[PDB]
C-alpha cells in the first residue's frame, strides 16, 4: 500500500510493525486511487568499486526501460538499467559504499564504455549557477505545474524532471535537500524572486515529511498535470516561457473554466485528433517565441557528458507578451482613460474658441470619442470572449463569466460578417480597437471657465470593440434525420430594427397584438422546398417569388448576419409539412400583400456558400422618389438628434458634395462604427429639400447602415488645390475648397461688436442691454465681420472673413488686435460702411497699402454644396468708365468664405 520509508536500508523481505503511522487518501484528481503511507522513523522487527556518492542524479527515467545513473568518487560514473531500482532510495550523498561486481559496456550517443551493472550487490541571454540547497516548503503556487515556494524567497519548479511520486509528499512543511540545481536570477515574465529548478542531474531528496494535512480540493488548481508535462517534454519550452505559460493558462481559467467549459476539459492534454483547447489558445504566442524545430532533449547527454541542459543552463529574460485580461477590466479601464484624457480646453483651442457663445461652446463639447489600441500597452493585452447574439435586443456581444462587451465585426475590408455559424464560438483577436464615445451635458459660460470645475452636469460613455475576422482566430467550444426542410432565398433589402405595430388577425374577435421589437427582410425564393437526406439536401419540389420574412420575438437575434446580395438558407425542423415555406403576425406597413411569412422561433438560418447606389442626380429639386442610397465618409458628428456630415464617394462626380444626415428619436442610439473617419454605406434614406433649397437626408425605418471600414490610426493632411479664380466661373467640375493666391482691392464693411455670450445681444461696458432680463454671469465675448474684394489676375470675388480672421486680414499683431478690441468695449457697436480716435484710425487703415496687399487666401464657397441652384439668364448693370454709361450683361458675383489667410513672401 505505497510504502514511503525515509532513509531506506535493505531489510526488504522483513520488518513489519511500523509504530509511526501516517496515511493519506486519494485527492479527488486521482482516478486510479491508491493512497499512500508516510513511515516516519525506523520500524521495529570485472572488478569492484568504492568511493563516495556525489550526484546520484535523482532520475529513474521512463524512456522504454527504467534506469538511473550514479556517479562516484572522492570521478567514476555508473549506470543501472535492471530491476534493482530500489537502490535509489537507500543511497545518500556523503556516505562511502562498496558496490561490487561491475562490468564495462558501451552505450549509444557517444561510445565511451561507461560502467554498467549486472546481478550485483551493494555494501557500506543569461547563465545560471549550480547551488546545493536545503530548505523547507512553506507554500504551493501551482501543484499541477510543479511551482512550489520555499521560504520567504526562492521559488521552486520541479517541472524539468519526471515527477509523479513527488506530488504526493509535497505539502507545506517538507524539508528537501537539493544537490545540483540551476539558479535563475532574472527570469522576469511577471516573476520577481529567483527561481530554483533542478534537472536530470540534480538530486532531489527528502529529509523529513510534512506534519500538516492537505488543504482543500479546489477543482480550480488541481487539474492539468498532463498538459503541463506536454509543454516540457514534447513542446520543448524554456523556463522563462514555462512560467509565462502557467500564468496565462490560469488567467484563462478565470474567464472560461467553470461555465464556458470544464476544468478537466480545458486543461487536458492533446490527443492525436484535435483536443486541448487550452493549448490551441496559447499557440499564436508560443509559435513566434519558441518555433517548432529544435534539438531533441537526449537522456544520457544531460548526465554523462559536458553539461548542456534543457535550457536551464542558458536562458533568456522575457518580458510578458500577452496577459489576457477579462472583459470587465477592459470595460472599466476603458472609461477611466476616457475621462482622465477628457480636457475641454484641448477640444476647443484658444484662438478659435474665444469667440463662441455659451450655446455653441457647449454644443462642440457634447460628443467626442477616443480609440485605444490595447496591443500597444506594456503587457500588450489580447481580447478573448464567446460570441453571443442577444435574443432580446438583437445586438452582437463578446462574453465571458465577468461581463460582456458590444462588438462590431467585419469579415474583411468592405465586407460584412454574414455567417451565423459563429454564435457560440470563441473569438481570439490580438489586433483590435477599443472605442469609447463620450456624451457630456455641460454648461460652461465662456472660454475662461474651460479649466474650472463645476460646469459638467452629466457624462456617460459607450465602450465597444472593432476588429476584422481575418486578424482573429475562431475556435469552436467542444460539448462535454429526415425530419427537416429547407429553402434558399436571395436577400434584397433589410429593414430597420425598431418597435412596430401589427394588424389585427382576420376573422377573430377584435384584439390587437402587442407592439414588439421586430424587423423584416425582402427576399426572393430560388427554388422549392428541399428535404434533408443524410447530411445534405435533396432535390427541390416543383415550384412572382418575392417574400417578406418577419422576424420578431426570440427570432430577432439573426439581425447582424443578414446582408443584401448574399444567399441564405432557411431551415425548419420537425415533420415534413407540405405547405410550410409558402405562407402562414403582420406589420402595419405591410397590409395588402399576401406574401409575408413569419419566421418561427425554432427555425435556423445559415449561409449557403457591390450594393445599390443612387447617381449624382440626387441633387435635383423636382423629385417623386424620396429614397436615396450612397456610400460616404463621415467628417463630423454633433449632438443637436444626431447630425452627421458626410463626404460622398462617387467615381463619376470629381469633387463630390457634402451632405448632412440627421438621426432622430426612434433611431437615436445609432450603429456602432459611425465615427469621424469611417467609410459607411447608407441605403434607403429620406431625401428632403429644406426651405433654403439644401438637400439633406434623414433616417427612416428602412435605412440599413453598413460600415465599410474603420477610421485610420493617423490622419493625413491632403491640402487644398491651387485653383485660378476664373475656374469657379467658366465650365463645370470645379472644387468648392481651394487656395487662389490673390490681391485685396477694397473693403466693403467692418463691424466690431461685443455680445453677451448667453444671448447674442450687445453689451455696452459688459451690461446685457437686451431688454432688462436676467442673466447669471456678467461675461462678454467679441465678434468681428469684414467683407473684402480680393481678385486674381483672372477674376474677382467677395470674401467674408469672420472673427479672429479679421485680424491677419488687416495685418494686425495679436497684441494690437486685442488693444483695438477693448477700445470698442465702451461703445459696443463700431460699424463702418466704406468718434475722433476711432473711425479715423480704421478709415486710415482700411484704405492704406498696408491692408490692400497681395495675399494668399484659402477659402470655401459659401453656397453650401448641397444647394439646388437654378439656371437663370444674366442681369444688366451700368459700369460707367470715364464719362460713358454703357450697359453689359453680368453673372452673379462670386461670394466666398475664408478658412485662413497668409502672406505671399
Amino acid at each position: 500500500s505505497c510504502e514511503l520509508i525515509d532513509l531506506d536500508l535493505s531489510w526488504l523481505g522483513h520488518l513489519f510493525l511500523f509504530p509511526r503511522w501516517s496515511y493519506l487518501p486519494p485527492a479527488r484528481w486521482n482516478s486510479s486511487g491508491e493512497g499512500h503511507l508516510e513511515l516516519w522513523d525506523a520500524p521495529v522487527p570485472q572488478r569492484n568499486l568504492a568511493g563516495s556518492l556525489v550526484r546520484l542524479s535523482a532520475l529513474v527515467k521512463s524512456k522504454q526501460k527504467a534506469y538511473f545513473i550514479l556517479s562516484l568518487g572522492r570521478v567514476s560514473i555508473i549506470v543501472q538499467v535492471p530491476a534493482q531500482l530500489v537502490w535509489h532510495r537507500a543511497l545518500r550523498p556523503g556516505t562511502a559504499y562498496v558496490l561490487t561486481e561491475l562490468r564495462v559496456s558501451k552505450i549509444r550517443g557517444q561510445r565511451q564504455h561507461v560502467w554498467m551493472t549486472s546481478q550485483s550487490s551493494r555494501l557500506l541571454v543569461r547563465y545560471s549557477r549550480l547551488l546545493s540547497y536545503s530548505g523547507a516548503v512553506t507554500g504551493v503556487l501551482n501543484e499541477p505545474a510543479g511551482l512550489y515556494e520555499l521560504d520567504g524567497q526562492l521559488g521552486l519548479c520541479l517541472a524539468y524532471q519526471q515527477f509523479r511520486g513527488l506530488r504526493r509528499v509535497m505539502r507545506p512543511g517538507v524539508c528537501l535537500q537539493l544537490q545540483d540545481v540551476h539558479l535563475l536570477q532574472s527570469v522576469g515574465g511577471g516573476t520577481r524572486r529567483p527561481v530554483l529548478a533542478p534537472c536530470l542531474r540534480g538530486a532531489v531528496l527528502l529529509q523529513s515529511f510534512s506534519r500538516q494535512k492537505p488543504g482543500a480540493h479546489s477543482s480550480r488548481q488541481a487539474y492539468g498535470a498532463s498538459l503541463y508535462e506536454q509543454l516540457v517534454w514534447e513542446r520543448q519550452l524554456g523556463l522563462p516561457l514555462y512560467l509565462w505559460a502557467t500564468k496565462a493558462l490560469e488567467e484563462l481559467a478565470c474567464k472560461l473554466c467553470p461555465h464556458v467549459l470544464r476544468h478537466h476539459q480545458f486543461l487536458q492534454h492533446s490527443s492525436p485528433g484535435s483536443p486541448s483547447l487550452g493549448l490551441q489558445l496559447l499557440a499564436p504566442t508560443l509559435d513566434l517565441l519558441a518555433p517548432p524545430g529544435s534539438p531533441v532533449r537526449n537522456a544520457h547527454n544531460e548526465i554523462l557528458e559536458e553539461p548542456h541542459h534543457c535550457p536551464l543552463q542558458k536562458y533568456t529574460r522575457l518580458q510578458t507578451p500577452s496577459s489576457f485580461p477579462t472583459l470587465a477590466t477592459l470595460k472599466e479601464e476603458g472609461q477611466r482613460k476616457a475621462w482622465a484624457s477628457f480636457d475641454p480646453k484641448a477640444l476647443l483651442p484658444l484662438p478659435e474658441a474665444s469667440y463662441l457663445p455659451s450655446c455653441q461652446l457647449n454644443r462642440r463639447l457634447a460628443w467626442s470619442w477616443l480609440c485605444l489600441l490595447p496591443s500597444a500597452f506594456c503587457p500588450a493585452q489580447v481580447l478573448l470572449g464567446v460570441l453571443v447574439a442577444s435574443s432580446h435586443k438583437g445586438c452582437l456581444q463578446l462574453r465571458d463569466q465577468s461581463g460582456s462587451l458590444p462588438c462590431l465585426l467585419l469579415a474583411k475590408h468592405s465586407q460584412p460578417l454574414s455567417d451565423p455559424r459563429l454564435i457560440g464560438c470563441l473569438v481570439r483577436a490580438e489586433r483590435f480597437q477599443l472605442i469609447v464615445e463620450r456624451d457630456v451635458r455641460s454648461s460652461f459660460p465662456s472660454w475662461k471657465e474651460l479649466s474650472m470645475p463645476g460646469f459638467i452636469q452629466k457624462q456617460q460613455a459607450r465602450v465597444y470593440v472593432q476588429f476584422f475576422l481575418a486578424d482573429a482566430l475562431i475556435l469552436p467550444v467542444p460539448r462535454p434525420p429526415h425530419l427537416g426542410q429547407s429553402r434558399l432565398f436571395l436577400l434584397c433589402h433589410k429593414e430597420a430594427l425598431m418597435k412596430r405595430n401589427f394588424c389585427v388577425p382576420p376573422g377573430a374577435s377584435p384584439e390587437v397584438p402587442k407592439p414588439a421589437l421586430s424587423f423584416y427582410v425582402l427576399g426572393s425564393w430560388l427554388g422549392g422546398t428541399q428535404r434533408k437526406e443524410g447530411t445534405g439536401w435533396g432535390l427541390p419540389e416543383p415550384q412572382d417569388q418575392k417574400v417578406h420574412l418577419i422576424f420578431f420575438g426570440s427570432s430577432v437575434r439573426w439581425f447582424e448576419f443578414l446582408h443584401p446580395g448574399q444567399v441564405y438558407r432557411l431551415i425548419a425542423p420537425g415533420p415534413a409539412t407540405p405547405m410550410l415555406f409558402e405562407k402562414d403576425r403582420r406589420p402595419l406597413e405591410l397590409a395588402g400583400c399576401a406574401s409575408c411569412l413569419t419566421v418561427q422561433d425554432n427555425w435556423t438560418l445559415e449561409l449557403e456558400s457591390l450594393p445599390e447606389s443612387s447617381l449624382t442626380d440626387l441633387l435635383s429639386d423636382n423629385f417623386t422618389d424620396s429614397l436615396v442610397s450612397f456610400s460616404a465618409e463621415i467628417l463630423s458628428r454633433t449632438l443637436c438628434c444626431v447630425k452627421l456630415t458626410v463626404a460622398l464617394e462617387t467615381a463619376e462626380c470629381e469633387f463630390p458634395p457634402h451632405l448632412d444626415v440627421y438621426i432622430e428619436d426612434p433611431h437615436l442610439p445609432p450603429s456602432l462604427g459611425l465615427l469621424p473617419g469611417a467609410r459607411v454605406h447608407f441605403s434607403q434614406l429620406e431625401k428632403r429639400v429644406s426651405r433654403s433649397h439644401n438637400v439633406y437626408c434623414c433616417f427612416r425605418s428602412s435605412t440599413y447602415v453598413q460600415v465599410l471600414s474603420f477610421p485610420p490610426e493617423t490622419t493625413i493632411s491632403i491640402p487644398l488645390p491651387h485653383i485660378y479664380l476664373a475656374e469657379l466661373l467658366q465650365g463645370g467640375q470645379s472644387p468648392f475648397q481651394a487656395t487662389a493666391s490673390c490681391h485685396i482691392v477694397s473693403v466693403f464693411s467692418l463691424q466690431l461688436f461685443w455680445v453677451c455670450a448667453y444671448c447674442t445681444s450687445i453689451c455696452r461696458q459688459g451690461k446685457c442691454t437686451r431688454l432688462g432680463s436676467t442673466c447669471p454671469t456678467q461675461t462678454a465675448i467679441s465678434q468681428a465681420i469684414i467683407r473684402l474684394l480680393v481678385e486674381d489676375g483672372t477674376a474677382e470675388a467677395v470674401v467674408t472673413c469672420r472673427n479672429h480672421h479679421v485680424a491677419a486680414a488687416l495685418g494686425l499683431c495679436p497684441r494690437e488686435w486685442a488693444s483695438l478690441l477693448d477700445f470698442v468695449q465702451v461703445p459696443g457697436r463700431v460699424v463702418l460702411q466704406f468718434d475722433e480716435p476711432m473711425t479715423m484710425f480704421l478709415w486710415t487703415l482700411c484704405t492704406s497699402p498696408s491692408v490692400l496687399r497681395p495675399i494668399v487666401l484659402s477659402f470655401e464657397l459659401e453656397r453650401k454644396p448641397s444647394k439646388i441652384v437654378p439656371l437663370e439668364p444674366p442681369r444688366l448693370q451700368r459700369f460707367q468708365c470715364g464719362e460713358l454709361p454703357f450697359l453689359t450683361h453680368v453673372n452673379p458675383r462670386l461670394r466666398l468664405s475664408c478658412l485662413s489667410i497668409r502672406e505671399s513672401e
Binding site: 444567399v567 485660378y724 476664373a726 498696408s850
Partner: protein
C-alpha cells in the same frame, strides 16, 4: 470686335489684368466704348504692372513716374494723398510712397489714351521692397503661365440609347457587359436572380421596348441573354433540381483536373489503333460520366484553356494527342 453687351460675362473684365507693357502699348481700343481695350477678344478695362522707376516728374497734386519692365516703358499718373497707433501707421504708408529713380513699384490702374500716347491712371500704387530680386523673378515665371492658360484662350450611341434598338438586337447587346462582371469578381457559380439585382445590368434591360407585367418580362430578357453565353460555350449547368443555377467554365478547375487525368492512361486504351485520341474519344468518357446532355461547345473549349500545363501536342485541329 466683341459686342459691348457681352463684355461683362468675361471674368477678366472686372479683374486687374497682369499684362506686359509691350501688350498694353499695342492693344487696340474699342470703337464702341473708349477706355476699354481688346487683347485677343477680351475686354481689358484695368491692368496691373510691376517695374522699375526710370523718371520722376512732380506736379502740384500728382506724380508721373516712368516705369520700365524690360518689355516697354509707360507713364503712370499717381495722385497725391489709439493715437499712438494711428500716428505710427501714417509713417508706414508714407514710406511705401517714397519713390525715387531705381525703385520697384506696383501700379494698378486704368489705361487712358491721350492722342496716340497712352498712360496708366493709378488707383493704387506702392513701393515694392525687393532686396534679393525675388518678386520680379517670380513675375517673369508667372506671366507666360497666365497667358497660355487664360488670356490666350478665347472666351465662349446604341449602348447609351438602348431603347432604340429592339429586343432581338438587345440580348446580344447585354451579354457582353454581363460577361465582364464575371471576369474580375472571381465568381465560380451564380443564380439568375443575382444578376437581376445588380443595377449595372438592370437599367440596360427594362427599356421602353417592353411596354408590350414589366418586372416579369425582365426575367425573359435575362434568361435569353445568359443562354447566349451557354450556346457560345462559356457557362453551363448540371442536373440539380432548379434551372436558374449556372457555373462558369473558366473559373472552376475540379473539372479541369478531370480533363487532365484522362492522359494518365492515354485515354484508357492502348495504341495498336489510330494514333492517339480524338476530340470525341473524351466524349465516350465525359457524357456517360458527368452529364449525358453535355454540349459540344464546352467539350474542346476546356482544352483551349489548360494548353499551357504542358499537356499534349496540339499538332493540328480536330485531333487529340497521346503521350
Amino acid at each position: 470686335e466683341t459686342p459691348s453687351l457681352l463684355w461683362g460675362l468675361d471674368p477678366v473684365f472686372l479683374a486687374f489684368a497682369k499684362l506686359y507693357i509691350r501688350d498694353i502699348l499695342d492693344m487696340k481700343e474699342s470703337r464702341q466704348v473708349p477706355g476699354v481695350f481688346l487683347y485677343n477678344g477680351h475686354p481689358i478695362k484695368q491692368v496691373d504692372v510691376l517695374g522699375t522707376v526710370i523718371g520722376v516728374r512732380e506736379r502740384d497734386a500728382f506724380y508721373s513716374y516712368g516705369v520700365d519692365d524690360s518689355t516697354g516703358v509707360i507713364n503712370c499718373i499717381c495722385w497725391k494723398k489709439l493715437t499712438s497707433q494711428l500716428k505710427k501707421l501714417q509713417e508706414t504708408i508714407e514710406q511705401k510712397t517714397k519713390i525715387e529713380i531705381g525703385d520697384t513699384i506696383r501700379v494698378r490702374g486704368s489705361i487712358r489714351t491721350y492722342r496716340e500716347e497712352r498712360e496708366i491712371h493709378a488707383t493704387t500704387y506702392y513701393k515694392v521692397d525687393d532686396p534679393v530680386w525675388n518678386i520680379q523673378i517670380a513675375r517673369m515665371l508667372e506671366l507666360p503661365t497666365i497667358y497660355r492658360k487664360v488670356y490666350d484662350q478665347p472666351f465662349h450611341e446604341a449602348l447609351s440609347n438602348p431603347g432604340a434598338l429592339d429586343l432581338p438586337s438587345l440580348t446580344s447587346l447585354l451579354s457582353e457587359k454581363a460577361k465582364e462582371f464575371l471576369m474580375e469578381n472571381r465568381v465560380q457559380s451564380f443564380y439568375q436572380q443575382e444578376l437581376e439585382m445588380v443595377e449595372s445590368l438592370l437599367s440596360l434591360a427594362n427599356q421602353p421596348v417592353i411596354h408590350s407585367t414589366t418586372s416579369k418580362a425582365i426575367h425573359s430578357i435575362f434568361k435569353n441573354a445568359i443562354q447566349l453565353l451557354q450556346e457560345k460555350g462559356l457557362v453551363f449547368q448540371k442536373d440539380d433540381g432548379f434551372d436558374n443555377l449556372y457555373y462558369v467554365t473558366r473559373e472552376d478547375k475540379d473539372l479541369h483536373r478531370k480533363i487532365h487525368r484522362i492522359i494518365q492512361q492515354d485515354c484508357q486504351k492502348p495504341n495498336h489503333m489510330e494514333k492517339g485520341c480524338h476530340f470525341l474519344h473524351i466524349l465516350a468518357c465525359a457524357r456517360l460520366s458527368i452529364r449525358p446532355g453535355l454540349s459540344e461547345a464546352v467539350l474542346q473549349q476546356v482544352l483551349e484553356l489548360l494548353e499551357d500545363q504542358s499537356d499534349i501536342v496540339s499538332t493540328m485541329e480536330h485531333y487529340y494527342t497521346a503521350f
